[PDB]
Amino acid sequence: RLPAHLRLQPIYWSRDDVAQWLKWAENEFSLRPIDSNTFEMNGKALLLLTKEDFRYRSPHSGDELYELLQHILKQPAAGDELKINAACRKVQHMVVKAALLADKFPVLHDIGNPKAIKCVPQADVEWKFYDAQPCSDKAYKIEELFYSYATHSDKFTDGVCLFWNCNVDRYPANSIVCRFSAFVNLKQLPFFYYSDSPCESHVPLKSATCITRCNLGGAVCRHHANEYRLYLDAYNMMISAGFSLWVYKQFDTYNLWNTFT
Numbered sequence: 001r002l003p004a005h006l007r008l009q010p011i012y013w014s015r016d017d018v019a020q021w022l023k024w025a026e027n028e029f030s031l032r033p034i035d036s037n038t039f040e041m042n043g044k045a046l047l048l049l050t051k052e053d054f055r056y057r058s059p060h061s062g063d064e065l066y067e068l069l070q071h072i073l074k075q076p077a078a079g080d081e082l083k084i085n086a087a088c089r090k091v092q093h094m095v096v097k098a099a100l101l102a103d104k105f106p107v108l109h110d111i112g113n114p115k116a117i118k119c120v121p122q123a124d125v126e127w128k129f130y131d132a133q134p135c136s137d138k139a140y141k142i143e144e145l146f147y148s149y150a151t152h153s154d155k156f157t158d159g160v161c162l163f164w165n166c167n168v169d170r171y172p173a174n175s176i177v178c179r180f181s182a183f184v185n186l187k188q189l190p191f192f193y194y195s196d197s198p199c200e201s202h203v204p205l206k207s208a209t210c211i212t213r214c215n216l217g218g219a220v221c222r223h224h225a226n227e228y229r230l231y232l233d234a235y236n237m238m239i240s241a242g243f244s245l246w247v248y249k250q251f252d253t254y255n256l257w258n259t260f261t
């Protein structure tokens with residue numbers, strides 16, 4: 001089974017997630033009561049312990065807890081589709097909005113979008129929609145096109161191209177890509193969080209990937225710390241599901257920091 005708050009792979013587990021795992025296994029298997037701090041570590045460290053270490057920490061259930069973890073590793077749980085759907089929209093909005101602010105593309109070519117929906121409606125950019133099979137109710141504002149690099153590598157050179165879960169043979173250089181040799185023109189997109197929303201004072205967040213105005217001095221406000229952690233869960237939930245993010249090579253996070261001056 002699964003408790004719906006341990007659905008990600010154990011490598012993504014936090015210290016509190018491990019405590020929930022011990023408490024969940026205490027009732028699911030009628031194990032003897034065990035203190036939460038018996039395994040005071042994150043999931044990334046719990047995977048480095050030996051089975052002998054489990055017995056030393058928990059003489060009554062250490063061997064049972066170890067074998068339970070192995071089956072979790074051998075058979076990863078499936079994430080909820082709606083939560084994965086929400087995670088994909090949140091990451092898509094974050095990445096595209098940041099890219100448009102960083103490099104100020106005059107036009108966006110959304111390739112693979114059959115519903116003519118902008119993920120960044122306030123972007124102030126010419127939004128173009130392309131799809132091989134446009135929806136009937138949106139085809140009037142969608143160009144019917146099947147993208148192939150051998151056919152269109154000389155097209156859509158202006159602005160940026162968006163291939164969000166649009167698996168094509170090879171992406172052009174000016175691309176923003178999510179996918180579940182084709183990325184030779186691109187680079188991997190590292191994790192980051194960007195927010196231009198106002199700060200509000202009502203655990204201190206230490207991270208160089210929190211691109212917020214309050215983090216210029218290292219003091220992330222409560223509002224952006226909570227939004228950062230909610231986004232990180234969505235990012236991890238999407239990476240755990242087998243999605244990878246790729247971007248044009250000149251993408252630079254320092255362009256996002258310059259938006260605060």
Ligand SMILES: N#Cc1cn([C@@H]2O[C@H](CSCC[C@H](N)C(=O)O)[C@@H](O)[C@H]2O)c2ncnc(N)c12
Binds near residue numbers: 114131166167
């Ligand atoms: N292979 C391939 C191709 C598949 N698509 C379209 O991309 C979509 C993938 S599902 C929706 C993805 C959307 N960007 C979203 O963010 O939800 C479908 O509508 C499919 O018809 C294509 N379109 C243009 N040229 C192609 N070469 C393909």
Ligand SMILES: [Zn+2]
Binds near residue numbers: 198199214215221224
């Ligand atoms: Zn802030």
